[PDB]
Structures are given as structure tokens and as C-alpha cells.
Amino acid sequence: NLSIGDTTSIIQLFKNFTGPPSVATFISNFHSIVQSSKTLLNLFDVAEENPLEFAKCMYELVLKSANSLGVLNPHLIANNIYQSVVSNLDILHSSAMVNLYANAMAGSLFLEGILNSDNAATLAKKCANDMEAFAKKMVEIG
Amino acid sequence: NLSIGDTTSIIQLFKNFTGPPSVATFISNFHSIVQSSKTLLNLFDVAEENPLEFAKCMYELVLKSANSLGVLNPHLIANNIYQSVVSNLDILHSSAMVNLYANAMAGSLFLEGILNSDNAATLAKKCANDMEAFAKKMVEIG
Secondary structure, three states: OOOOOOOOOHHHHOOOOOOOOHHHHHHHHHHHHHHHOHHHHHHHOOOOOOHHHHHHHHHHHHHHHHHHHOOOOOHHHHHHHHHHHHHOOOOOOOOHHHHHHHHHHHHHHHHHOOOOOOHHHHHHHHHHHHHHHHHOOOOOOO | OOOOOOOOOHHHHOOOOOOOOHHHHHHHHHHHHHHHOHHHHHHHOOOOOOOHHHHHHHHHHHHHHHHHOOOOOHHHHHHHHHHHHOOOOOOOOHHHHHHHHHHHHHHHHHOOOOOOOOHHHHHHHHHHHHHHHHHOOOOOOO
């Protein structure tokens, strides 16, 4: 099944007790993937260096990522993330560095009509795995 | 909201099967507030007309709203929402137009330690009610 959070059938998805918005399951997956995957933390462990390395990496990565996904205006996501990082630069902390990324991208990917109740986990994995895969061009052996 | 928005239902939210973050319940509140307030929906009903009116409204609105909420970098949320409003022209839906405003504000409040599992209703209400209050401040008089 390749999901791990999948432990109960569609009965519990339609039990009339719950129904969080699709934006919430994306950001909750993203925060969990950061804790599960050392290579995300291995970038934030060097966020004490030049902050433009992280901010310019984020902009240029989101430029290719949002184009590859097929977003209506892929510049909007990269610009949102670059501007939120460079201004609110007080919060270089490991989780805080992705709280802006995950919220800005979750609300912006919504604009393509994607980010369904389950596809939100696929998009969260895509964005988080592309983040560490590109960070390996900027981070070094250690 | 005839006390219907404050019934201390949080006992049902803490039942060993769910527990979404403060940033998610804000967005669910925002949807309910947008649906109940006719004047919020009456803004997005004119979406067939000039999109610059929404972009300039949201830019000037968020500039003073984020300062009034005491946010560290009020320019970021205004700049991000402004660029995003000129970048969702294919999906100018009522819930979609407000999704960018609400989720960008929610993430920017969350990172700073503002916005909480019950205070999110107060923040969502004042942020939503200021949107229609600034829309009815650019229409003609008769």
C-alpha cells in the first residue's frame, strides 16, 4: 500500500464525525515527512550559514517544481516563498523554515484544482523529497 | 453569529481519533464565516470584472491588518497575497479567492506564536469582516 497512515477502510473517511480541509492533510504530512527524513534536517543544520543559499535554492527549486506539477502561474509559489523567507528571516529554525514553505505551497497548489483528501500526501512527499534532492547540490559530505 | 460559532464542541475534537493544528481550524472557520456573511460573497460574485480591484483591495487591506494583528513583517503577507490574486485568474471562485488570503495569513500568524485552537475563530472573523468592510469602501454611493 506504500502509505503507512492507511490503517482503516473508507468507512472511517465517511463516519460523519470528522472532515478537515484538504490543505490541512498536506501540511500535516509535510511536517511528519520532515521528522521522518534526516536529509531535510541536514539542510536546517547549516541554516546558520548565509541565508541567501537557502532562499535562492527555494526560489529556483519551486520555479522548476511548480512548472513540472503544471501550476496556473508557477512564479507565484516561488515568489511567495522567497519573499516570506527573506522578510521573516528571524525564524531559521528547522520546523519554522518549512511552516512558511508548506503553507504557501498548499494554498498555491489548490489553484490548479489538485491537492485532494489523499493526493495531498503525494504532493507533500513530492515537494519534501525534491527539497532534499536539490539541497544535496548545496550541502556537502558530513 | 447567534452564539452558534462558540458551543465548546472541542470535547468531540479530543476523542482519540483526531487533533488538527490551530492553523487548520482557522481555515475551516474562515469557510463558515465566508458562507454566512453575504457581503464577503458579494465581493467574489463580481469576479467577472477587473481583477486589479481585488489585488489592490487585498494589498492595502493586508498592509494595515497584519500591522493591527502585530505581525513581525506585515509586507510579506500583503506582497504574497497581491502576487497570488493576480495569479489565480482561472479559479476566481468564492472559496478559492479567500483560500489564498486565509491560508497565507494563517501560516504567517502560526510561525510567530499568534493563532490558537479557539482564538483562530476571533482572528478569522476580524480578518474576514475587514475584507467586506474595505470592499464597501471602494464601491459608488447612492
